[PDB]
Symmetry: C3
Subunit: 332 residues, 3 copies
């Protein structure tokens, strides 16, 4: 009887940060209430000033990470304000039935809807917009995010012992297909609708013009680098709603990795690089052992360093010479 379950309202936070949650469930099953507002907005995606009309959940690319526990109910109020121009909806890969909720959530501008589903399978999962006839255009304009359904007793290693993370970050990786003129210059449009047929042609090349973390080239660098300390246990959730990626922590490893993101399976150990298929979210757990700058990349290095799929961690603490040392510094 759902009316007798506790309700809890969660306020979401901007990626790469994740809303507060407990890893081990401190209550019984709950109805967990989330609100998201769709925002169509112009986004500058690179250092050259290339602009796209992005379609976002809650104003960010990716949309925010939602966190619940296995056998909670998720109740999402989805709002499409009348300042938007397009029909949108939401498909959760976590959900069962009605095209992951897509059949039930079609909202024109000026409409809202509330969907509830039971989170029956533990794992990280993609969610994304999927309106009939314009699915890849919405998704590759940024309209995707992820949801994490934790086991009620938290994460476990390959031996079934508890794994507890100290910090969690969410990296959404986005392939964009910005249309080009004859000479190869990016085109601009006043409205999302203007771009449509040109967007279709650009997508059909299967060759993204940009592949970015958190919505822009260089988004997770400088003042916005991810931080940790030596000895901290970090979980990085990574999603790609449309195209394969292969994450790699330069200078580290994935100590425990669920590459296809589903926590009933044992993790893969000691990964250098792992493949997350398009349409999937994965999760990697690592304990930092050395201080300094790390780069976190898609290890197609052209995709990383030319197209934008690279971010930084800055890690504080003590250097361990036993793990690595320069014996003779570069010299003639």
């Amino acid at each position: 009887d759902i009316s007798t379950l506790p309700r809890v309202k969660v306020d979401l936070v901007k990626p790469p940060f994740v809303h507060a949650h407990d890893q081990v469930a401190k209550t019984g099953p709950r109805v967990v209430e989330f609100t998201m507002t769709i925002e169509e907005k112009k986004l500058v995606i690179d250092r050259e000033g290339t602009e796209i009309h992005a379609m976002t959940f809650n104003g960010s690319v990716p949309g925010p990470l939602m966190v619940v526990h296995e056998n909670d109910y998720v109740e999402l109020r989805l709002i499409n304000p009348d300042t938007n121009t397009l029909l949108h909806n939401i498909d959760f890969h976590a959900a069962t039935g009605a095209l992951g909720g897509g059949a039930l959530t079609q909202v024109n501008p000026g409409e809202e809807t509330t969907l509830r589903f039971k989170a029956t399978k533990p794992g990280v999962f993609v969610y994304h917009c999927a309106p009939e006839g314009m699915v890849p255009w919405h998704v590759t304009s940024g309209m995707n995010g992820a949801i994490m359904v934790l086991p009620r007793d938290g994460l476990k290693d390959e031996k079934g012992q508890p794994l507890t993370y100290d910090k969690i970050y969410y990296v959404g990786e986005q392939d964009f297909y910005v249309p080009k003129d004859e000479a190869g210059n990016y085109k601009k449009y006043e409205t999302p609708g203007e771009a449509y047929e040109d967007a279709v042609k650009a997508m059909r090349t299967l060759t993204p013009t940009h592949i970015v973390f958190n919505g822009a080239v260089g988004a997770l660098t400088g003042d916005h680098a991810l931080t940790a300390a030596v000895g901290e246990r970090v979980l990085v959730v990574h999603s790609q709603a449309n195209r394969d990626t292969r994450p790699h922590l330069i200078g580290g490893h994935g100590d425990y990795v669920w590459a296809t993101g589903k926590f009933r399976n044992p993790p893969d150990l000691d990964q250098e690089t792992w493949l997350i298929p398009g349409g999937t979210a994965g999760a990697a757990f690592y304990t930092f052992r050395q201080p300094g700058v790390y780069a976190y990349v898609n290890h197609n290095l052209i995709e990383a360093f030319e197209l934008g799929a690279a971010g930084h961690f800055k890690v504080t603490g003590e250097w361990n010479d036993d793990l690595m040392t320069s014996v003779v510094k570069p010299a003639s």
Copy 2:
């Protein structure tokens, strides 16, 4: 002594259906006899009427699913009628030696051959044509299919308990590379041979023009949608002889998945999306829990909704509001 084994002749059926078989073996090892006839034929692959010269086993793309048990012998009579124009052969990834049988099965038009091999490893496996010097042209013209070698005691879950399917379907996914003129219009040819050099150039782009299930855009829709009922256990076998794919059941999951298709390994549980590498067959088991239309796609959504890699299931039965419900229908 092979002459003392029972022989059984199987008549194959058109994909996505699969010939009758037992999951748990009701006899000892058998010699299982199959006949396939090669047909070169014109195929219309899209809604625009684009035509290719397809090269098929038994008249379909993909070729039919063959089903045997571990340590059966497969005996295939392969017929290349003199109405065809090309040399063909057959490579089974299930087989050991002679390039999977390719070295032994080269048939000019007007020839036939009979190959026997022992099915020593359980799993689903690709088979495909592979004539010396023209391998990718034959395969990407449709000349591929799959064979399932069941364990003698059927499928098992990750705990070694039996998994029994009620229904099985075979989805062959095909990347086509239709040559284009200067402006981007598809070219037409009177014979397969005419297309050769243009086919090579189109393949070298590594960019398919169409990616389809069961040989055409929209093949597994409408009257030809896959069917099931709530509560049915369905196994979907999916192959891709040349290029990676990432299947996803929109509104469902892969409850048990062998992404690289080999049944001695435990299945991955609760998958949203899985990667089947090119040159592999995989298998996903799901129990339907909700009625309605499901889309089964390659989750590069451009490949699905623009290039053709999408099909439908239509599922009958009772709606379960506990799993999903619309709390407030879309309204202003």
Copy 3:
């Protein structure tokens, strides 16, 4: 105390061969000393005579396989002679800290450096050049190789029983992006530096012009085919520093496969084809059961047979008719 450990100097050998080593460690932890010299050199990569300026470790593409045991220390002297023109460095995916050693090994022409790291995780791992600002250009010019860190008690199967190989080969697969003129002819340059901006444009297409094993089309064929005998247990180590690949032994299987290459995980059994993500090394173990020629390919067959990613094994011994036989030879 590192000064009290034995030191052993290893002389490396050219791929696809691997330096002598023990599978089960016959000593305690050691400091294992390697020397590599960077060579920038012109390489002819195809039958047409296309030339590139390759950037190599030790004169080969790929660089040589280094083999150590878990918890050995690796000490590498890296030499950049003054006949080279570029700055180089080395990132080991096996290592922890300082961008896998990349931050500590930047050598201008005429400089050398010595790095030491502890090999704390068992598996095969990529190493590659990674100079700030020019990472994918160095890697896709050939500057990558692999290192194998064996468990101290050797390899194990999925049940934890020993697996011993008789022979080991290293296949480095390389994606090249040779710049083209307007008509599609490959360009030539006097120096590596000349090619830079054209190289960047060619990489951004994400479409390699060549994909080769051991540095050239046809490198592992003819007199240079890999050899084995019926009954031999062969380990093939395969790396791809930048782009996904899907190896397949035509006429065989991967009996035990670590597709992402990390030996603390159980192997996948009976694989037809496996996916090694870009930025990873994998390893496949197979026992040959039939004599003859086998082709070892990336099973995107266009990548294999049109772009160059195919090699041969030649296997001697007795034919087994029980596994495969021609019942009726091709005839009218």
